Design a protein around this ligand. Structure first.
Ligand SMILES: Nc1nc2c(ncn2[C@@H]2O[C@H](CO)[C@H]3O[P@](O)(=S)O[C@H]32)c(=O)[nH]1
Length: 104
Protein backbone atom coordinates (compact mmCIF):
# COMPACT_ATOMS: atom_id res chain seq x y z
CA UNK A 1 0.00 0.00 0.00
CA UNK A 2 1.30 3.46 -0.69
CA UNK A 3 1.84 4.61 2.84
CA UNK A 4 3.55 7.69 1.34
CA UNK A 5 3.27 8.98 -2.22
CA UNK A 6 6.07 11.26 -3.45
CA UNK A 7 5.11 12.54 -6.86
CA UNK A 8 4.71 9.18 -8.64
CA UNK A 9 6.77 7.16 -6.19
CA UNK A 10 4.92 4.93 -3.75
CA UNK A 11 6.56 3.92 -0.46
CA UNK A 12 5.48 1.58 2.31
CA UNK A 13 6.30 2.19 6.00
CA UNK A 14 9.00 -0.51 5.83
CA UNK A 15 10.71 1.29 2.93
CA UNK A 16 10.78 4.49 4.98
CA UNK A 17 11.83 2.64 8.14
CA UNK A 18 14.72 1.03 6.26
CA UNK A 19 15.95 4.34 4.84
CA UNK A 20 15.66 6.06 8.22
CA UNK A 21 17.68 3.39 10.03
CA UNK A 22 20.48 3.73 7.49
CA UNK A 23 20.53 7.53 7.65
CA UNK A 24 20.37 7.60 11.44
CA UNK A 25 23.25 5.13 11.82
CA UNK A 26 25.48 7.33 9.67
CA UNK A 27 24.52 10.37 11.70
CA UNK A 28 25.36 8.57 14.87
CA UNK A 29 28.72 7.40 13.58
CA UNK A 30 29.46 10.87 12.32
CA UNK A 31 29.72 9.72 8.71
CA UNK A 32 28.27 11.10 5.48
CA UNK A 33 27.98 9.87 1.86
CA UNK A 34 27.31 11.56 -1.47
CA UNK A 35 28.63 14.87 -2.68
CA UNK A 36 25.85 16.65 -0.74
CA UNK A 37 27.03 14.92 2.46
CA UNK A 38 23.98 12.99 3.56
CA UNK A 39 22.55 12.82 6.13
CA UNK A 40 22.71 16.56 6.57
CA UNK A 41 20.82 19.15 8.54
CA UNK A 42 17.32 20.12 7.53
CA UNK A 43 16.52 23.63 8.81
CA UNK A 44 12.81 23.49 7.93
CA UNK A 45 12.74 26.59 5.69
CA UNK A 46 9.46 25.23 4.29
CA UNK A 47 7.91 25.47 7.76
CA UNK A 48 6.38 21.98 7.92
CA UNK A 49 4.44 21.44 11.15
CA UNK A 50 6.45 18.39 12.17
CA UNK A 51 5.15 16.85 15.41
CA UNK A 52 8.58 15.81 16.65
CA UNK A 53 11.27 18.26 17.70
CA UNK A 54 14.43 19.23 15.85
CA UNK A 55 17.29 19.18 15.01
CA UNK A 56 16.09 17.56 11.77
CA UNK A 57 18.24 15.78 9.17
CA UNK A 58 17.39 14.72 5.62
CA UNK A 59 18.38 11.42 3.99
CA UNK A 60 17.50 10.18 0.45
CA UNK A 61 14.91 7.45 0.00
CA UNK A 62 15.17 5.74 -3.42
CA UNK A 63 12.26 4.51 -5.55
CA UNK A 64 14.37 1.49 -6.54
CA UNK A 65 14.14 0.24 -3.00
CA UNK A 66 17.90 0.37 -2.63
CA UNK A 67 19.42 2.15 0.34
CA UNK A 68 21.26 5.34 -0.62
CA UNK A 69 25.01 4.93 -0.79
CA UNK A 70 26.61 7.98 -2.34
CA UNK A 71 25.31 8.48 -5.87
CA UNK A 72 22.42 10.49 -7.33
CA UNK A 73 20.04 11.25 -4.48
CA UNK A 74 16.90 11.65 -6.53
CA UNK A 75 14.06 13.90 -5.34
CA UNK A 76 12.72 12.09 -2.22
CA UNK A 77 13.88 12.36 1.40
CA UNK A 78 13.03 10.99 4.83
CA UNK A 79 13.51 13.58 7.61
CA UNK A 80 14.33 12.32 11.11
CA UNK A 81 15.60 13.83 14.39
CA UNK A 82 18.28 13.11 17.01
CA UNK A 83 15.88 10.86 18.93
CA UNK A 84 15.56 8.77 15.76
CA UNK A 85 11.91 9.71 15.32
CA UNK A 86 10.51 10.17 11.83
CA UNK A 87 9.46 13.78 11.24
CA UNK A 88 8.14 13.18 7.74
CA UNK A 89 8.68 12.21 4.09
CA UNK A 90 9.22 15.08 1.60
CA UNK A 91 10.12 15.53 -2.09
CA UNK A 92 11.46 18.07 -4.55
CA UNK A 93 8.88 16.78 -7.08
CA UNK A 94 6.22 19.41 -7.68
CA UNK A 95 8.15 22.07 -5.79
CA UNK A 96 9.96 24.91 -7.48
CA UNK A 97 13.66 25.72 -7.20
CA UNK A 98 15.23 23.64 -4.43
CA UNK A 99 12.07 23.62 -2.32
CA UNK A 100 10.28 20.59 -0.94
CA UNK A 101 6.61 19.61 -0.65
CA UNK A 102 5.38 16.85 1.64
CA UNK A 103 4.62 13.38 0.42
CA UNK A 104 0.99 12.39 1.00
N1 LIG B 1 14.82 23.34 0.84
C1 LIG B 1 15.58 23.27 1.93
N2 LIG B 1 16.90 23.18 1.84
C2 LIG B 1 17.56 23.11 3.01
C3 LIG B 1 17.00 23.12 4.26
N3 LIG B 1 17.99 23.04 5.25
C4 LIG B 1 19.13 23.01 4.58
N4 LIG B 1 18.95 23.06 3.21
C5 LIG B 1 20.00 23.22 2.18
O1 LIG B 1 19.79 24.51 1.52
C6 LIG B 1 20.20 24.48 0.14
C7 LIG B 1 19.02 24.91 -0.70
O2 LIG B 1 17.85 24.09 -0.63
C8 LIG B 1 20.66 23.06 -0.10
O3 LIG B 1 22.07 22.95 0.17
P1 LIG B 1 22.18 21.43 0.60
O4 LIG B 1 23.21 21.55 1.66
S1 LIG B 1 22.86 20.09 -0.56
O5 LIG B 1 20.79 21.14 1.48
C9 LIG B 1 19.94 22.19 1.06
C10 LIG B 1 15.58 23.21 4.34
O6 LIG B 1 14.91 23.23 5.38
N5 LIG B 1 14.94 23.29 3.12
Amino acid sequence: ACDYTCGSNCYSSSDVSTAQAAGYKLHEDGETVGSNSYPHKYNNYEGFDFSVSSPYYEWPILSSGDVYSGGSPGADRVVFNENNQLAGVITHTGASGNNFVECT
